Amino acid sequence: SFSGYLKLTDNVYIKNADIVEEAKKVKPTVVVNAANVYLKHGGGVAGALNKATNNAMQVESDDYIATNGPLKVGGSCVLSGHNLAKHCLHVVGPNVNKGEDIQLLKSAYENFNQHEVLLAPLLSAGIFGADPIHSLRVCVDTVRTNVYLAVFDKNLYDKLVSSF
Ligand SMILES: CC(C)[C@@H](Nc1ncnc2[nH]ccc12)C(=O)O
């Protein structure tokens, strides 16, 4: 039910929107979370998605970490999408503010290729500290499945489109 997106490539689309509000409207098969390795959903996309689930995402995530241990930077896991989507794909992009290797951003986006269509944010951008223009270029050059990108900041959205 995706609507109002700008086509960037054969398989990549973009919209100025809060990913939480997009997930409530569309109820997609997969929503991507910008996770950390511990699945501690405090702020940014992860804190906003978790709050919209009334903390059910964090309770499920804590059980997953208690059983499996932490994810790898560049890795992912599939958990419930609760009231927002059928599934949530928690993907860990490198956090530049912590010295993590930006080359791991391509490995993070490769997780998207396991799903035919996804609603997603720009990985490693926002509070993770990487350049969003770089993140969109890695997304375009790595993901082959259909990805609908939601960018919250209007000013950044306009810059991403103009410089594409
Ligand atoms: C990742 C980053 C580039 C982006 N953040 C987001 N993008 C989309 N929905 C969101 N909900 C909460 C945060 C958020 C932004 O600052 O525009």
Curated annotation (Swiss-Prot):
Activity regulation, per record: Inhibited in vitro by GRL-0617.
Coiled coil: none
Domain Macro: start-end pairs: 1-164
Highest taxon listed in the record's lineage: Viruses
Topology in membrane: Multi-pass membrane protein
Reaction(s) the record says it catalyses: Thiol-dependent hydrolysis of ester, thioester, amide, peptide and isopeptide bonds formed by the C-terminal Gly of ubiquitin (a 76-residue protein attached to proteins as an intracellular targeting signal)
Annotated compartments: Host endoplasmic reticulum membrane
Subunit structure comment from the entry: May form homohexamers. Interacts with N protein.
Reported function: Responsible for the cleavages located at the N-terminus of the replicase polyprotein. Participates together with nsp4 in the assembly of virally-induced cytoplasmic double-membrane vesicles necessary for viral replication. Antagonizes innate immune induction of type I interferon by blocking the phosphorylation, dimerization and subsequent nuclear translocation of host IRF3. Also prevents host NF-kappa-B signaling. In addition, PL-PRO possesses a deubiquitinating/deISGylating activity and processes both 'Lys-48'- and 'Lys-63'-linked polyubiquitin chains from cellular substrates.
Protein name: Papain-like protease nsp3
Encoding gene (name): rep
Portion held of the full protein: 1027 to 1190 of 7096
